[PDB]
Amino acid sequence: QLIAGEHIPIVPVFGEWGFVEDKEVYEGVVRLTKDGQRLRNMIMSFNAD
């Protein structure tokens, strides 16, 4: 079907950017704050026990 436009309508936004070797990688805010958060949760659970 013939779309009226001239470009693909979808407009993307990206976290930071990145191509490491040949594959794209994007990040946000939560990627690096997961291990510490999980450790904090585990320690709090153990202390409650």
CB 15 within 8 Å of CB 30: no
Query: For the CA atoms of the chain, what is the radius of gyration?
Result: 21
Residues 11-40 that bind another protein (CB under 8 A): 18, 20-21, 23-26, 28-40
The correct pick among 4, 10, 11, 29 for binding a second copy (CB under 8 A) is: 29
* Residue 6 interacts with which of another protein, a second copy, none, CB < 5 to 8 Å by class: none
CB 25 within 8 Å of CB 16: no
**What is the contact surface with a second copy in residues (CB under 8 A)?**
29, 32-33, 35-37, 39-40, 42-44, 46-48
